[PDB]
UniProtKB/Swiss-Prot annotation:
Keywords: Cadmium, Metal-binding, Metal-thiolate cluster, Zinc
Name of the protein: Metallothionein
Lineage, top ranks: Bacteria, Pseudomonadati, Pseudomonadota, Gammaproteobacteria, Pseudomonadales
Ligand binding (Zn(2+) 3): 5, 10, 28, 32
Induction: Up-regulated during the stationary phase.
Effect of residue 22 to N: No effect on metal ion binding capacity
GO MF annotation list: cadmium ion binding; zinc ion binding
């Protein structure tokens, strides 16, 4: 009943209509969804994820 980012390290604003689905989980952006492949940051407020 709550739509949040899949990244367990980052609390990002997820768009209910533009949500990136991955592994059955919801993501704010492709960045967190793809586990950040080549250093792609997410549109998070202050952001946290810098790993992987
Ligand atoms: Zn995110
Ligand atoms: Zn992330
Ligand atoms: Zn982030």
């Amino acid at each position: 009943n709550e739509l949040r980012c899949g990244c367990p390290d980052c609390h990002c604003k997820v768009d209910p209509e533009r949500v990136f689905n991955h592994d059955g989980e919801a993501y704010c952006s492709q960045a967190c969804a793809e586990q950040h492949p080549n250093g792609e940051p997410c549109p998070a407020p202050d952001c946290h994820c810098e790993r992987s």
